[PDB]
Assembly symmetry: C2
Homo-oligomer: 157 residues x 2
């Protein structure tokens, strides 16, 4: 199938033009040229347009592929950045939480020691309070310490 | 473009017309010849170029499908990473604030503790300066000063 080759076309054109041939034989050469050309032209116009619509569909999908590739690459850079940021914050959170647990324990241990001294000072205040009317000079020295502020009772560094 | 079928047919008729000049039939022949040679060659090139674009379009269309589907799975993974990132950032921020709060508490507690301690040692020294008078109130205070935890 397909169109005649240039050589079969010329042999048929030569048979058509050969006066030595029977005029039926030359009519046959003519019908072949006719039917070949009618099909050739139609299949040529089909190939012509159907190739032009491969070309623009290709040029279209190719250009859409150009941007999608840039877009995906940019996403991969963000995932790498985001994983480094997540890990950095995770590491900071775990370590800072350990520091919280430590300080929480410190606050407990200081409170127990603070409360111990406080109760001793409060008991002595209550004892001195019971004897205020005696105006004992030693009790009054103790009372001056008991009610001294942190500016009237400096603690060294 | 190639001759149309009606133009090809009209040239066929001139070619075979003995009323025409020899030159006219010869021209008609060369038109049929060069028209066919020119465009059977284009025809073959069109057939190849079409087959070219069809197989190349199958490649770009297959890549486009995979790059798009991958980009979608990446948009999701990106978002999963962002959510995990923000989650740990917020926990890091909260726990740093808790560190700063407890650090100030420790500082204040240390000063209060040292403050009471200094007063108790001061009061202890007052009481031993007067252990001679054997005041029962003072001995009560000394018992408190020397009491052990629980």
């Amino acid at each position: 199938s397909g169109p005649l080759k240039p050589e079969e076309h010329e042999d048929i054109l030569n048979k058509l033009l050969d006066p030595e041939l029977a005029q039926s034989e030359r009519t046959e050469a003519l019908q072949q040229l006719r039917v070949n050309y009618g099909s050739f032209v139609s299949e040529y116009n089909d190939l012509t347009k159907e190739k032009s619509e491969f070309k623009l569909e290709l040029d279209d999908v190719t250009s859409n592929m150009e941007q999608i590739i840039k877009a995906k690459a940019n996403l991969e850079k963000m995932c790498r950045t985001l994983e480094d940021q997540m890990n950095e914050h995770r590491s900071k959170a775990e370590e800072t939480q350990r520091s919280v647990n430590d300080l929480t324990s410190q606050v407990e241990d200081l409170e127990k020691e603070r409360d111990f001294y406080f109760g001793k000072l409060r008991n002595i205040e209550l004892i001195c309070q019971e004897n205020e009317g005696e105006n004992d000079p030693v009790l009054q020295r103790i009372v001056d310490i008991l009610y001294a502020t942190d500016e009237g009772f400096v603690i060294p560094d």
